[PDB]
Each structure stands twice: as structure tokens, then as C-alpha cells.
Amino acid sequence: WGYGKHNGPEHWHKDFPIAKGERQSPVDIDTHTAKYDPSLKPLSVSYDQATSLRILNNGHAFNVEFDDSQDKAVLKGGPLDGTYRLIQFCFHWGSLDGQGSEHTVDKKKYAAELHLVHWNTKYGDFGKAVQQPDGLAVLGIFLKVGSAKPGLQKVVDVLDSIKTKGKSADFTNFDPRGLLPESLDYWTYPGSLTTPPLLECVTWIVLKEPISVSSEQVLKFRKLNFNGEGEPEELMVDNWRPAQPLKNRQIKASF
């Protein structure tokens, strides 16, 4: 699978039949229909003691991996039960600044989407968490081009070194708190991973305030390549699945 016209999203169903599932992601959020539910707790994001390891180009995105050992970077609260521990984050962007995000709000697309992916400790690991409908909790955060985000700056400057499918940069001591918005209100719906295997195990929490990145910072994401060392240059852009059928399903709102 990949994101091309021949191995892209419209073909994922041949190999991961679940792509045609009851609760696939992304979806588009129509606000003039999400349900404000007076019972969603706030967010208890405690990223005090979050330890990053490496950032890597895996040929569909770049991700940054964290050390998920004691209950140190954890997401609690929200629609969640248990401690969700942090494994990595995903970043989706477009071939231009008006496409890139996976979730749309009232059909509007942002310039990018960041995903911090966490797994439920009650299942002992990432491995055994994904076969369960309550196994992962993912905060999706939208990016709009505005003034720069100082916290994203270290991410945009190391990208020179993970340019091609397969390179890895060492990247310790990055603080995921410098990527978050001011407000933590959100919309939550149950869904899948947006990438193959496309497993329906995710309670998604999308944040309503985006974060401003300057177009110089978004342009750095666009210098990266899908292709591996050697082979002809396939620029890594538009690494996003389109919005999928909601299936009645309701998106609830904290606000």
C-alpha cells in the first residue's frame, strides 16, 4: 500500500478488507450535528517525563517514537477508562496548503494533521492493544498556517536527515507539550487507524483549536521523499486518507 493512484486509499480494501468496515477513520465532522455530551471529562495529558527516542521516515510518513515504559507520557480523562500510554505520533500533509488533514471539519481541510497515538496499559502493550476496540486513544491536532509554532521547530530542522524511505535520526528530549493548543475541548468518535491495518481499535479525540505553523515550517515536510535510497525521487506529499462513512455513529462534543 502507499498513497499513489495505483496503490492508494481506493485500493486498500483488497488487502485489508476492513477498509470497508463500520468504523473507519478519518471522518468529516459536521458541527451542525455533533452532540454536546455533558459527561465527557476533561483531558488529563501528563507529558511531564515523556522520552523521545528516534524520528524516522518509514516511507508513508515520518513518526517520532517514544519510550513507553512507566506511566510517564499518559493521556487519561476524556471518554477514557484506564491509562493510555504514549507510543508515537503520525503527521499527514498535502501537496499545497489547503489539503493534508485527514479529518475535515464541515468539509474544511487544514494544512496538516498531527496524531499522538497512545495505547491502553490494561492490555500490556501496543501489540495486544490493537485487536481490541478500546485499545488505542489518538489525539488528532489540526495545523493551520499562521505564525510559527516554536515547539515544532526542532522537528522541521531534523527532517533534512530522514529524507528518504528508511533513514533515522536520533531525537531525544523533544517535549510533546510544545505541539499542543491552548484549549483542550474536543470531539470524540470511535474509529480505526487511518493507515493499513486499518484496525477499528481507536477512540479518537480531535481538538478543536488547531495549532499555527508558519508556511516555512509546513514547506519542510514537503521536501521529504516516499522513495528509498537510490530509486527515483517520489516526493512525499498528500499522505492522507479521505473521510470515510460515518455509519450513523455520533461524534460527541466536550464543548
Side-chain angles (χ1 to χ4, degrees), residues 157-178:
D157 308 312
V158 82
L159 299 178
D160 63 287
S161 341
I162 51 162
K163 195 188 154 71
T164 46
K165 177 207 160 181
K167 294 327 298 155
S168 257
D170 240 41
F171 185 88
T172 296
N173 281 165
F174 169 75
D175 206 77
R177 297 177 287 161

Side-chain angles (χ1 to χ4, degrees), residues 2-3 13 49-50 57 86 108 137 152 185 195 201 226 254:
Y3 292 96
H13 66 102
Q49 186 69 223
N57 183 332
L86 183 71
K108 151 171 283 293
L152 194 84
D185 302 311
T195 247
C201 54
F226 273 146
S254 61

Side-chain angles (χ1 to χ4, degrees), residues 124-227:
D125 44 1
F126 191 68
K128 188 86 233 118
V130 296
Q131 89 306 338
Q132 220 71 54
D134 66 322
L136 315 157
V138 186
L139 305 166
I141 300 188
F142 299 121
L143 286 67
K144 75 174 212 56
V145 160
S147 294
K149 190 65 173 213
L152 194 84
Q153 197 70 62
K154 180 177 184 276
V155 188
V156 153
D157 308 312
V158 82
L159 299 178
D160 63 287
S161 341
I162 51 162
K163 195 188 154 71
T164 46
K165 177 207 160 181
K167 294 327 298 155
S168 257
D170 240 41
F171 185 88
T172 296
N173 281 165
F174 169 75
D175 206 77
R177 297 177 287 161
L179 299 180
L180 287 174
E182 223 157 88
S183 169
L184 270 49
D185 302 311
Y186 60 75
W187 291 284
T188 185
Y189 73 112
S192 66
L193 279 168
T194 56
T195 247
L198 299 161
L199 288 172
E200 308 197 332
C201 54
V202 202
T203 278
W204 271 92
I205 300 116
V206 202
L207 273 44
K208 173 194 60 301
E209 169 182 316
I211 33 158
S212 292
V213 305
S214 53
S215 283
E216 333 189 296
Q217 292 176 326
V218 104
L219 285 158
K220 284 291 279 293
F221 299 160
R222 288 180 175 132
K223 299 172 183 190
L224 297 185
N225 311 164
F226 273 146
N227 65 281

Side-chain angles (χ1 to χ4, degrees), residues 29-145:
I29 308 125
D30 184 13
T31 57
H32 309 297
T33 34
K35 173 105 236 63
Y36 165 61
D37 168 311
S39 318
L40 264 34
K41 275 158 282 171
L43 278 184
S44 199
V45 160
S46 331
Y47 290 160
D48 343 299
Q49 186 69 223
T51 299
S52 61
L53 305 183
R54 55 113 70 132
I55 181 162
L56 69 150
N57 183 332
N58 56 16
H60 300 280
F62 67 84
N63 297 170
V64 166
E65 176 169 287
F66 289 81
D67 185 305
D68 57 3
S69 303
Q70 221 81 311
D71 281 333
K72 36 175 48 207
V74 309
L75 215 195
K76 306 192 289 150
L80 309 159
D81 253 282
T83 298
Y84 285 77
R85 211 185 275 174
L86 183 71
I87 183 79
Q88 48 155 244
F89 74 49
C90 122
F91 263 95
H92 300 286
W93 51 96
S95 45
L96 221 55
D97 283 2
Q99 299 161 6
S101 56
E102 292 213 308
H103 294 83
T104 34
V105 198
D106 285 326
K107 283 278 100 152
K108 151 171 283 293
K109 311 200 177 55
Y110 288 91
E113 183 139 356
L114 153 54
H115 290 134
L116 310 99
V117 172
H118 319 64
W119 58 275
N120 200 328
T121 49
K122 76 160 86 293
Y123 289 123
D125 44 1
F126 191 68
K128 188 86 233 118
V130 296
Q131 89 306 338
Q132 220 71 54
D134 66 322
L136 315 157
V138 186
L139 305 166
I141 300 188
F142 299 121
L143 286 67
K144 75 174 212 56
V145 160

